[PDB]
Design a protein around this ligand. Sequence first.
Ligand SMILES: CCCCCCCCCCCCCCCCCC(=O)OC[C@H](COP(=O)([O-])OCC[N+](C)(C)C)OC(=O)CCCCCCCCCCCCCCCCC
Ligand SMILES: CCCCCCCCCCCCCCCCCC(=O)OC[C@H](COP(=O)([O-])OCC[N+](C)(C)C)OC(=O)CCCCCCCCCCCCCCCCC
Ligand SMILES: CCCCCCCCCCCCCCCCCC(=O)OC[C@H](COP(=O)([O-])OCC[N+](C)(C)C)OC(=O)CCCCCCCCCCCCCCCCC
Ligand SMILES: CCCCCCCCCCCCCCCCCC(=O)OC[C@H](COP(=O)([O-])OCC[N+](C)(C)C)OC(=O)CCCCCCCCCCCCCCCCC
Ligand SMILES: CCCCCCCCCCCCCCCCCC(=O)OC[C@H](COP(=O)([O-])OCC[N+](C)(C)C)OC(=O)CCCCCCCCCCCCCCCCC
Ligand SMILES: CCCCCCCCCCCCCCCCCC(=O)OC[C@H](COP(=O)(O)OCCN)OC(=O)CCCCCCCCCCCCCCCCC
Ligand SMILES: CCCCCCCCCCCCCCCC(=O)OC[C@H](COP(=O)(O)O)OC(=O)CCCCCCCCCCCCCCC
Lengths: 43, 230, 62, 104, 199, 300, 118
Amino acid sequence: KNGIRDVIDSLNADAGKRKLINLEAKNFIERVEKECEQRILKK
Amino acid sequence: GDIRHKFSNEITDDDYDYQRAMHVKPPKEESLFQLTNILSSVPVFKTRFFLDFIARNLDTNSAVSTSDFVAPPRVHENSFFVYHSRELGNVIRKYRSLESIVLPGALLTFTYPLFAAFVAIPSYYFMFNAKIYEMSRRFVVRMDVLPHLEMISVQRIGAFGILYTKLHRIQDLEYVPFDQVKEQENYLWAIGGHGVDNQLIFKDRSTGEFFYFERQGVWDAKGLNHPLLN
Amino acid sequence: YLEPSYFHETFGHMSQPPKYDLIDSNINGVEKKLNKQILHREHNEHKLDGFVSMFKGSDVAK
Amino acid sequence: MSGLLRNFEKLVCQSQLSKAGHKLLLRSPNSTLHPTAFYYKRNSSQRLANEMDVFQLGLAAAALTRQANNYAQLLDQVDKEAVREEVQERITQNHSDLNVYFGE
Amino acid sequence: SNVDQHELKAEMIKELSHYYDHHDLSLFGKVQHFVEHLLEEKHHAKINTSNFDQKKLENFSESKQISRTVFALKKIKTFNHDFFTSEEEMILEPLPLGILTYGLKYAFAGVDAALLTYFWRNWNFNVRTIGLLGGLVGIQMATLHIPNLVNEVVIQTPRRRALAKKYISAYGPQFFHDIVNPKYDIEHLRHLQNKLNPY
Amino acid sequence: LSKYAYFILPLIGSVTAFYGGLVSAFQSDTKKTLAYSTISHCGFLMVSYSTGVLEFVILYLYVHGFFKAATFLCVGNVNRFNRNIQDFKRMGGFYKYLPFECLASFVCMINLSGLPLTLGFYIKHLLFIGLVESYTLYPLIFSSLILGAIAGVFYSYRLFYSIFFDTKKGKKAIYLQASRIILNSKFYSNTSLASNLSITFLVLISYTVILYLYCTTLNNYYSLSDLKSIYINNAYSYFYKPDYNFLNAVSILNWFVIILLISVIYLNWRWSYYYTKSIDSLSKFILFSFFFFIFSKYIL
Amino acid sequence: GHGAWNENQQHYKYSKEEIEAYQVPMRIKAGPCVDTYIPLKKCFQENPTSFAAKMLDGRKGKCAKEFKYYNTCLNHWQTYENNSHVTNAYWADTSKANADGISNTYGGSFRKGLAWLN
Ligand SMILES: CCCCCCCCCCCCCCCCCC(=O)OC[C@H](COP(=O)([O-])OCC[N+](C)(C)C)OC(=O)CCCCCCCCCCCCCCCCC
Ligand SMILES: CCCCCCCCCCCCCCCCCC(=O)OC[C@H](COP(=O)([O-])OCC[N+](C)(C)C)OC(=O)CCCCCCCCCCCCCCCCC
Ligand SMILES: CCCCCCCCCCCCCCCCCC(=O)OC[C@H](COP(=O)([O-])OCC[N+](C)(C)C)OC(=O)CCCCCCCCCCCCCCCCC
Ligand SMILES: CCCCCCCCCCCCCCCCCC(=O)OC[C@H](COP(=O)([O-])OCC[N+](C)(C)C)OC(=O)CCCCCCCCCCCCCCCCC
Ligand SMILES: CCCCCCCCCCCCCCCCCC(=O)OC[C@H](COP(=O)([O-])OCC[N+](C)(C)C)OC(=O)CCCCCCCCCCCCCCCCC
Ligand SMILES: CCCCCCCCCCCCCCCCCC(=O)OC[C@H](COP(=O)(O)OCCN)OC(=O)CCCCCCCCCCCCCCCCC
Ligand SMILES: CCCCCCCCCCCCCCCC(=O)OC[C@H](COP(=O)(O)O)OC(=O)CCCCCCCCCCCCCCC
């Protein structure tokens, strides 16, 4: 578990974090769209 | 010594004329597109309208010096002038005046005034402070002597180009040899001390303030020979 | 000229000289007014659509 | 000197400056041509004579005397007593300082 | 019945403009942006197009018809971007500015900067100089538009007219007259397809 | 797949870059200056390989090789004229005696030393784009890289100015032997026509090849041949769609270089008849720059 | 039409043999824009052009129809790789972004430089 293992693990963790950030951004845009739709309907 | 004439295909001054842009030679002929030729040929510039515009809207002859002797207005009704700075004083004034336009303008115009300040700070502390600012602070714009007080009035340029005058007793003036200060302020004299005289530095012992005199500054023979200063 | 990236990142984006087409001048009156309003609405909607599409399409590549 | 769309009629010609005895006075900002208040030390860690010269002491004494005379005029031209107490206190301080300086 | 697309888009614009339509401005830039947003054009989500009915096609003189067809082509391009090919898109867009225009603009900027530097250094500020600066700046701003007008009136105009004639021959004047009419369905315009485009 | 490579390539590359750049800046001999500049650029190449964009490494290699060779040829002509004295403390006012060398050296040096608006700026820009940030010694690595990158300006300016446009410091013989009127001829030159043509063609071909490589790699359509590597660094993301953070970060180095250029130009180390006028010119330049920026951004 | 940014005009997905034939550099093959890249490469092969023309032509001349899809795919690919669409939003308004967290993962560690205090 030594050598380039640490670098590979760090790269994998960073890639996972970036994917999570993209997914959270997608969830945010969906939530904003839903909130706007509900506000329009409730008027 | 020149043998170019012995050959028919040798280079000629007509061939070298193109180097007059990069090489300094006295004028030989005027091209059709020179400013002088254009102005002297085109009849538009001969119009009294253009002539009067030239005569009025430009630097005036009144401000042009007319003699090698200058008697600037007295600072005090009883004082007499000794030293005055001509060109470096004006240059320092115009440089320090930038703090009244660039600085507020930078604040109101730059998207990141903090970035501008962070860049300026180290720039000021290295290669700018010692370069210009300290020399200007210690620069003597004008020096007069008030005999009733037995004092000397020294005019200095402040922040934003403001001019302020201060009094120093003649009994408190001393000569500081350049050897005693060269090591202390090598950088200042290295990059910014060229304008002012190195061997004619004086200081006020009481206040510990220096006086830098411009190399291209005018001195008064009568002021120097006055008994108070001798 | 062709690579102003250094200028953009060293001084910022300077004012751009005017650039537009006079196609809209062909129509006049209420027709022109309504069409101009529709085009303005379409441009704003297009900007928003680009933004939302960029945000949503994160999962397009499986 | 230099200008565009301007007239320099009010400018001082260099001919007068070249001439001697032209009777021109210079008024410049932040000009202090009188040394009053330079050597006025309210509190002295030692005798004022040791540290200062007769010239400095005389300047301080003249300034204090003028200020005290002005405050005496204020006393004469003021009526309310409560406001007059501050003037009297300032005059007393000036008189004490003048006495010590003149003794030195 | 269903949530209105225009209203939903207007709400989303109001909510999300701060992200995709915000830049970093100085204090002067922020003041100018505030003035512009005060004297702005409101984002009308809904436009009432039930008052202006139409004009009869026969009224036009076959030149206004071509001009209206040019406008219809512009509208089609704005709504759906796959209708026109690259060359037709270039024809419809404003002609890009050139070195002449850019150099003229920056020479104007340079002369103005030199004049301001001279005025500050010599303290030559007065009514006449300020008026000269204002007039020069105004003349420069007016002139900066001249290259664009010349381009549009000389080069683009005949090309756009030729394209309009080609498309009129392809489809018919009424097809583009309907598009010019504001009542035309924007969704149908978006989903429209071009006969002359190989795609 | 080398842990040792990951740790060693960036650190040694950046240290070598800084060391070579500063030593070259402080150097006084032409060949020594070029040698230390070569050391610095090799350090930069190591750091680029550490970033892991082989295209950037190849571009850096090509740019450095071409312009280093051209500058070496120019300084060789200068040394031959100066009679094998390679130190520019004995070189001065050579612009007129070696006209071609002066201009060729100007072009070659501005390209070699990464300077704004030159073919050699993009290599350093891409290196900083690709620089990795997961290193433990990242502070030292980044500081050394910045110092090495800025060091180019000083050595380029010193070499060019001292060789060509400085006061005449060389022996009287060097100038007198060539200033004799008898030598005035259509054939007159202190260098070789073949040498001038060789340098000109080298510069032209280097420009063309560098442009071809830039089109192949840095263009929107990637048309480079396969590199036979399966390691993708993601560095091209900050070249295609850079963010505001990185765009403003690059400005720090840009303005550092600007201040250094202003220092090497307007800074006076010796008394001159033009001291006051030089300060005045600096003031004029500052004020004019401010007003020009104002008009360009706001008043148009 | 109406396809996602990764799909091409024909909505055709190329197989491994086709990729090997129209050999794609690993740099592009790693990303998701192989489908949009291959038509552009085929068009360039059919209509070869000089590197000067490629640099000076802003619409890729003849190969503009395919370059539109490729450019859209490239923009989306790079934006998602560097997370610039979220970083720019946080830069524009950090306070509002935290108020309605676009991505708490990035928000919790984001810290704009003190110099860029617009
Ligand atoms: C964390 C805290 C951060 C703090 C950061 C602070 C940043 C902001 C710093 C503010 C500095 C303010 C400087 C004040 C300058 C004046 C000082 C002074 O007394 O000098 C008097 C000096 C000298 O006065 P004097 O009395 O010796 O003589 C008068 C002038 N002469 C010498 C010519 C006779 O006078 C001036 O310089 C007058 C300047 C007037 C104009 C000042 C504003 C110019 C910029 C305007 C905005 C930008 C341009 C906008 C253009 C718009 C076009 C549409
Ligand atoms: C807030 C406290 C007060 C701050 C005072 C401002 C700093 C001190 C005075 C600076 C005067 C010099 C201004 C030059 C402006 C040049 C145009 C420009 O880029 O302005 C916008 C930019 C900033 O406008 P911005 O913030 O909108 O730009 C976008 C942000 N960047 C550029 C980072 C991407 O100006 C600067 O970056 C100035 C940096 C500070 C300079 C400090 C002094 C060193 C330079 C000596 C003077 C001569 C410089 C000549 C430069 C010529 C061009 C390379
Ligand atoms: C503190 C702020 C953060 C940054 C930290 C770093 C501070 C700046 C450090 C700069 C070091 C530069 C070393 C250059 C050595 C050149 C040696 C050489 O060739 O001989 C001298 C050559 C001249 O060679 P010459 O041949 O013409 O004459 C030599 C004359 N003698 C030998 C007598 C000295 O060049 C110079 O003189 C210029 C260097 C001195 C001036 C340095 C000014 C620094 C300004 C810093 C601005 C910072 C901006 C803000 C942002 C910075 C961070 C991003
Ligand atoms: C005349 C001799 C002395 C000159 C010495 C140099 C003076 C430098 C002063 C710098 C002051 C501080 C920066 C303020 C100006 C910022 C300008 C900028 O960023 O524009 C980039 C701009 C950015 O433009 P853009 O971002 O709108 O897009 C450019 C790309 N195209 C064309 C496709 C749209 O790039 C340019 O195009 C610059 C102008 C190129 C053509 C100029 C022709 C000559 C004009 C008259 C001479 C002007 C001389 C002054 C210097 C000009 C420099 C371009
Ligand atoms: C007495 C003869 C003396 C020798 C004369 C030789 C003259 C050579 C003149 C050209 C040299 C410089 C070329 C430009 C620099 C390189 C550019 C580059 O990187 O390539 C990009 C381009 C490559 O093409 P491209 O970059 O335009 O893109 C191609 C597009 N695709 C990929 C789609 C196909 O190459 C060139 O432009 C270089 C010229 C073509 C190659 C010519 C090789 C054959 C030469 C035939 C003549 C043989 C003479 C023999 C004489 C023998 C004497 C003993
Ligand atoms: C009823 C009649 C009405 C008539 C109305 C119209 C009248 C005419 C209006 C236009 C002509 C104005 C008069 C012509 C002279 C203008 C001079 C000028 O603008 O100032 C020059 C100034 C010189 O420096 P300064 O410190 O002011 O020294 C004073 C010397 N007397 O310059 C400076 O300060 C230096 C600025 C430059 C700094 C370095 C950069 C060099 C390049 C600057 C180029 C500027 C010129 C334009 C070109 C831009 C593109 C390069
Ligand atoms: C956080 C600060 C950010 C930067 C702020 C800049 C303010 C500029 C205006 C200053 C006005 C007051 C000046 C006082 C002068 C004085 O008598 O200053 C006297 C002071 C005090 O005396 P001493 O420190 O020598 O003992 O001297 C100083 O050194 C401290 C003040 C320094 C002020 C420097 C101002 C010039 C800055 C130049 C920046 C770089 C160049 C930019 C392009 C031209």
